[PDB]
């Protein structure tokens, strides 16, 4: 076998320049595709060269910041100094002139808008006052990243909602995830027939959520995921300074689930402290995983909302951690070490779309299992409580009815009308009470009903609720928080750290009550950028 | 942050009044809604005034006993010193008496009633008879907790089917049940859309389990369930003399499934004697769960049948596993250890309801998936029984035939008549070789056909059985005691218990043909008290 | 008790002849039955008395050899020792010999058929040329196990595909299984309703794997598959020589999957050496399972051809394994610890059922959501690659356009005609890909379209393919290698032996690429024996 030995021997010799050389190929080939099909036809082409152009710029500044990194510090670091110098007096100017900015910005969008607005703005800062009154620490309080998440949100709302490129952009983002979720129907047909239509909801609607995680898995092996929650995060830190760990967890937490966000720093778990467990916690309870957004997409809520929700939710969830629990210890793991995420065990992108596909179905069976127990808890808690009102002479007490009043003091502070806020009360009960499926369901009752243009009022009953409420609803409704689900974090999160299990159940509660103000938070936001149609 | 403080201080040193006093207000202002609802019309509030006097009377009850034990015991000690002085002659009136009297009620109610209830009593003589002599230690055998557990199953079936009061108490208990079963529909149409009836077991069955997993979840977290455990194995303890943990897994036994009522001892079940676990067995074989109530009501059984075989199986199975396995060694375990029932790690209700649910899962996919298997494997036999019988002229050999005969006398025993016996085999058949659900399948088959009314005898086959054999069948068929769950059941009592394995697997079999007795004692019992329509 | 005593003590004194003549009297019964039928009519009794004659002719063979086997080796002896000393010269008379009849046999039958079994003979020689080149050892390879499996499946393609005896027992083989695949229907009708064919795949076909596994299982309780793996397995070591726990494992992956085929030696499995554990997951990816014989079946694909395979898979993928990594090492197991196979835990034939049973959930969970995934990917692959191939004016770019020519080379090879090279390369390339379930669907797609007897060509595209490249297809697509499963596979062999675990990665690449060409060379086979209609 003397030719096998030569080749070997060739192989072991030049093997960086053989797979190099393979890849500078591929490129090429690839390359020559997108010119050849652009020389053709440009207007035609135009999408695919956009993508190659920005995917080549974002290859380029990475590998530039890899490998000047030291010289472009060296090249910052007298200009921080010189701001170092001055900051003494200028932090004054600086603030000034961003409060001035606010009372310009309220005076002359806010007050044109209406009333309903300046009742946001003033639900935000009560929500921001109760939050530091009812804080863990009231005297521990690092105040630069609440500002900065509240900024960082602001921002965003400016950016996506006030803005024509930023409207298109994310309006173009959620009619692309409408078009993805419906090449799950292609399995659902076969696997149940053309009549798989006739259950909605279990041979449509969980399929998505199959598919969705598949792609994710698919997406975590490529390893574009921990790209882009590196970018976020990284933004993050050096914006509200807050900790690496907690920074890329809230990252992570607005497309990974919460309890498989925290595997991304499982290593780093035992050495965290209460206050980044507590932000951790509290990051997992204020977002939504992206597997079981087709499932809220195809009830009838809005896509892009979706989004924009889940994107401010991250900022709001590490805002409102840090001051109801700030930090009082040292914090131990280093960027490097958090930025680092361990891939799986996956040997091939087909063997990670198995895997992602078999991870689906304990979700799927939880998903249904859940659903159809708090139905029946509520028809019976319903009929219930229509037994007890009847001997008032009031038979119409129901859950709803409670609930219509107990959180309506919440949803008027988020900014919606006096008559909206009863409605947008139940909604809440919903979410808070058995999960957030069972009020998006009701969501899109509602936006059904609304969009049908019948009657308003049905013998005095209101049918439907003004658009606004509507997208109020949906931001303030954007999470995994409900009284329910602080069993399986705790046990997660001491499955991943058995030696913390202490410290995680201390602070369930208050992560749980985090979530629900960030939430409340961006429902705020929100409600203050839209106007009344 | 002095306010805080002085807040932090105020709430340390007056704990426990202040939640004292947030409870009397919340007792306080049910009390008042009571009370107006009583003002405003008593006969529609009737129900909820006696709701709360049997609730005040209770817990004053309890509250008495735990306080005023040691009193109450000295009192009561010299009437025992008493009765145990007179004991030596009085006992031989007491017995003298009790023969006397089941000799009178003999002669001048079953005699009246016709030849099949003596046959009964026969019967259960006979299975007494047999109990005793293949017992394990026939010379070690206690005889109170037989007659005793006899006697108790004679009362209960007196006061349930021979009374008016208790026939209207157990009707409406098992008429509230059929309407508790219907909510699961509002959480079984939404998962499975307006069409879940097109899949009547799958998708109108199956959510009854699940929902009442969720409610007996609920309920145990609430801690009424060993409320009424201990009470009910207090009474047995006390009546029967055995074991505070036998007692104990026996009167669960009667709500919980014989593969989770032991966890209500697990901490002591290393400590047990052979006689113990096997009276656990039995009881865990004798009984069904409360799951599955629902499905059973659901094929069209009697519920108020099935309620009363479940409370009067336990007695059964305790007198049949002290007969069958008699006690030769020293219990290790008192009461106080046995009564302590260590509830589940459920911070709140919903989070209960939400466990509750996921354990449901694989409960109803193992039995949809058993159910799958044994009716091809019936098809299959039944096929190649009529293949091989053809080959003697006798094409119409089939398992239901073989069974019809093989089972006969035991259902001539419990007193069904000569023409039913042999239909009644075949159900006792079904239950013994696949399990309980299909037995019940074909109960509820046999019950629709008697109630549409159509010929009795079609080409010389009997199509349906009396009302009294169909009472005696639903008796008979009352339990798990099946061949295929040995395996399971031996798993997780060994898994509860790896130091046991040993004693675990000598005494399963013995378990099992003492459940199917008791179930057979329990028929007979029901049977001899029923009269012929 | 002294009766008791007396029982016990006769019990014990004589309980080898009180169980034997139990024994002697059922068979006695049995034998009077089969007799009895006889008499009254032979032509409707003829097949329990073959059955009957088969059994007792089985039970002696094995008793004798069993109690004579010295006896038999040493009269074998002395014909070894005679053979061993004229071996030297003989050797060269019996490869003539061979060569000349398979050289007789190409010109006098292959020829006659046409080209296309000539050039399935050409590719037969290029995959074992292509299967020496890239070897593990290419001089460290012992040519004896090679050629005795190519004979060996040539031998079993004349029997069956060339001879009215085999053609006839195998149609009648796989009828029985279509016979014995419809009885899952009677649970599938209660479980589902009868409208249960309104979703045909999920409602009616995973029941046929639920039933067939329950049976796999009860079988493998009854002993009988250890029986027939063990007959087989000698066969294969008596001929090729193979280690007896390859053999072992190789016989016992006909029936059962490649996850639960190693347990047959799990105690021996870190023992094992390189090449025999290559050789394990060669014979794993190169079969199917039992248990979804069924579905395949249910698709339309011919019942006979995928039982052909399963059998042939063996040898081929023993040789296979063999040529591709040979072995350098000494085996450390031996025949007789390799044949005994520890039985499961299962008490009696019922619980053997009910975990069989229990078994087969996360198999048809899997499968669904395998499905769900990998019909979902295939319609976005297809949408981007039409969006894609539009660019160039080429909209009809798809997965299928480009398997057909990136695989068409390897269907020409095995036979199959120009045309349909293009066809069996879509499915070749779903196999690869996703998994056989959708090349089998599309397969039996294909073959309904055939029988249909519509037009071959419309507007240009061959709609259907001839039978024999259909049953070329049936051939090649016999197996479980996919790139999807080499995880769950190192996965489980890993679990079964921890030890091993940096042996078991590396070679699992190259037994599936061996499991490939396994079942390439039984299609160049099945081609090459085939005919054109
Ligand atoms: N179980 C579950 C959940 C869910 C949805 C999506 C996920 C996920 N990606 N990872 C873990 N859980 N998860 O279903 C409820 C309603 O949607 C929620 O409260 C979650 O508890």
Redesign the pocket.
């Known amino acids: 076998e003397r030719m096998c030995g030569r080749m070997s021997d060739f192989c072991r010799e030049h093997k960086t320049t053989l797979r190099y050389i393979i890849w500078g190929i591929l490129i090429a080939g690839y390359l020559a595709l997108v010119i050849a099909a652009c020389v053709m036809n440009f207007h035609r082409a135009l999408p695919l060269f956009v993508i190659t152009v920005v995917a080549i710029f974002f290859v380029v500044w990475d590998h530039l910041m890899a490998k000047y990194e030291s010289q472009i510090a060296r090249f910052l670091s007298p200009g921080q100094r010189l701001l170092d110098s001055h900051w003494f007096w200028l932090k004054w100017v600086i603030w000034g002139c961003l409060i001035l900015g606010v009372i310009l910005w309220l005076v002359f969008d806010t007050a044109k808008l209406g009333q309903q607005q300046l009742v946001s703005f003033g639900g935000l800062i009560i929500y921001t006052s109760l939050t530091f009154l009812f804080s863990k620490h009231p005297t521990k309080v690092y105040w630069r990243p609440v500002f900065w998440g509240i900024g960082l949100q602001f921002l965003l709302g400016l950016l996506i909602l006030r803005t024509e490129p930023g409207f298109m952009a994310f309006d173009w983002l959620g009619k692309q995830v409408q078009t993805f979720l419906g090449y799950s129907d292609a399995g659902a047909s076969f696997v149940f027939g053309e009549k798989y239509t006739d259950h909605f909801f279990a041979f449509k609607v969980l399929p998505i959520?199959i598919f969705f995680?598949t792609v994710?898995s698919m997406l975590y092996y490529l390893g574009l995921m921990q790209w882009i929650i590196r970018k976020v995060g990284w933004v993050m830190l050096v914006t509200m300074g807050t900790s690496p760990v907690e920074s890329v967890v809230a990252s992570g937490n607005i497309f990974?689930?919460?309890?498989?966000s925290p595997l991304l720093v499982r290593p780093y778990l035992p050495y965290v402290t209460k206050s980044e467990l507590h932000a951790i916690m509290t990051a997992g309870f204020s977002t939504?995983?992206?597997?079981?957004l087709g499932?809220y997409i195809s009830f009838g809520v809005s896509s892009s909302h979706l989004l924009t929700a889940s994107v401010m939710s991250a900022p709001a969830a590490l805002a409102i951690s840090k001051l109801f629990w700030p930090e009082t210890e040292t914090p131990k793991i280093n960027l490097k070490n958090a930025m680092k995420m361990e891939s799986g065990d996956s040997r091939n992108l087909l063997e990670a779309a198995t895997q992602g596909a078999s991870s689906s179905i304990?979700?799927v069976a939880?998903?249904a299992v859940?659903?159809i127990a708090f139905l029946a808890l509520l028809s019976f808690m319903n009929s219930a409580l229509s037994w007890l009102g009847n001997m008032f002479d009031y038979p119409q007490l129901s859950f709803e009815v409670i609930c219509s009043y107990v959180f309506m003091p919440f949803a008027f502070m988020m900014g919606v009308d006096w008559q909206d806020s009863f409605m947008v009360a139940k909604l809440i009960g919903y979410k808070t009470f058995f999960?957030?499926?069972v009020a998006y369901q009701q969501l899109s009752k509602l936006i059904s009903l609304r969009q049908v243009g019948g009657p308003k009022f049905v013998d005095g009953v209101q049918q439907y609720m003004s658009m606004r409420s509507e997208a109020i609803s949906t931001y303030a409704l954007c999470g995994?928080?409900?009284f329910?689900?602080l069993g399986?974090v705790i046990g997660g999160l001491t499955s991943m750290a058995p030696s913390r299990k202490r410290d995680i159940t201390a602070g369930a509660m208050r992560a749980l009550i985090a979530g629900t103000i960030a939430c409340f938070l961006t429902a705020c936001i929100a409600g203050m950028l839209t106007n009344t149609p």
């Open positions: 959520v995680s994710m990974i689930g919460q309890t498989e939504i995983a992206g597997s079981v499932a304990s979700l939880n998903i859940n659903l999960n957030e499926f995994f928080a409900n329910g689900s399986i």
